[PDB]
A paper describes a structure:
The heterotrimeric Replication protein A (RPA) is the ubiquitous eukaryotic single-stranded DNA (ssDNA) binding protein and participates in nearly all aspects of DNA metabolism, especially DNA damage response. The N-terminal OB domain of the RPA70 subunit (RPA70N) is a major protein-protein interaction element for RPA and binds to more than 20 partner proteins. The RPA70N domain adopts an OB fold with a five-stranded anti-parallel beta-barrel but has very weak ssDNA affinity. Its primary role is to mediate protein–protein interaction with its basic and hydrophobic groove and a side pocket, as first shown by a series of studies of RPA70N interacting with p53.
In the structure of RPA70N–BLMp2, BLM residues 550–564 are visible and the peptide is bound by two RPA70N molecules. The C-terminal part of the kinked BLM peptide fits onto the RPA70N groove, with F556, I558 and F561 making contacts with the hydrophobic patch of RPA70N, while RPA70N residues R41, K88, R91 and R43 form salt bridges or hydrogen bonds with BLM D560, D552, D562 and the main chain carbonyl group of F561. Interestingly, the N-terminal half of BLMp2 latches onto the α1 region of a nearby RPA70Nb. K16b from RPA70Nb forms several ionic interactions with BLM D554, D557 and D559 to neutralize the negative charges. Q15b also contributes to the interaction by forming two hydrogen bonds with BLM D557. Near the tip of the BLMp2 peptide, Y551 fits onto a small hydrophobic surface formed by A9b, A12b, I13b and I21b in RPA70Nb, its main chain amide group also forms a hydrogen bond with the carbonyl group of E7b. Overall, it appears that BLMp2 promotes Loop 12 of one RPA70N dimer to interact with α1b of the other RPA70N, and that each RPA70N provides some of the binding surface for BLMp2. Using ITC, we found that BLMp2 binds to RPA70N with a relatively weak KD of around 18 μM, and that mutation of BLMp2 residues (D560A, F561A, D562A) almost abolished the binding between BLMp2 and RPA70N. Not surprisingly, mutation of the conserved arginine residues in RPA70N (R31, R41, R43, R91) significantly reduced the binding of RPA70N to BLMp2 and BLMp1.
Residue numbers in the entry: 4 to 125, 550 to 564
The structure:
């Protein structure tokens, strides 16, 4: 049911027109100050996870209403990939539909490894500088 390999497709091939089915692993606000929340997401395609997702603030009602939460499965309908000054490419989710609630799925799907650290095959890349989890937690 998840679009296995879609995270690599977005990050490696630049595919911006695909509509993949992903699982939300974690949601977190970018800052905790007194301001309208802006959420970052750790998403999974079942093979890899990627933490460089931001939810467009127009979609915040999905989070405030608890429709989008950890372990739910959603389909992305529109996104763009933006690059920060330091080089990091961040996927901005603009439109999405929750297909299965967190409660309905019940559990994390598969055994995904972080995209920065490993392959879609479940193995970890050679990391001679011990740095490739820098953008994960």
């Amino acid at each position: 049911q998840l679009s296995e390999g879609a995270i690599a497709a977005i990050m490696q091939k630049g595919d911006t027109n695909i509509k993949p089915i992903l699982q939300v692993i974690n949601i977190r606000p970018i800052t905790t100050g007194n301001s309208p929340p802006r959420y970052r997401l750790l998403m999974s395609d079942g093979l890899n996870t990627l933490s460089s997702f931001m939810l467009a603030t127009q979609l915040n009602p999905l989070v405030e209403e608890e429709q989008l939460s950890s372990n739910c499965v959603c389909q992305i309908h529109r996104f763009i990939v933006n690059t920060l000054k330091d080089g990091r490419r961040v996927v901005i989710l603009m439109e999405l539909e929750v297909l299965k609630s967190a409660e309905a799925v019940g559990v994390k799907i598969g055994n995904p490894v972080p995209y920065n650290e490993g392959t879609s095959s479940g193995s970890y890349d050679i990391d001679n500088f011990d740095i490739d989890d820098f953008d994960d937690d």
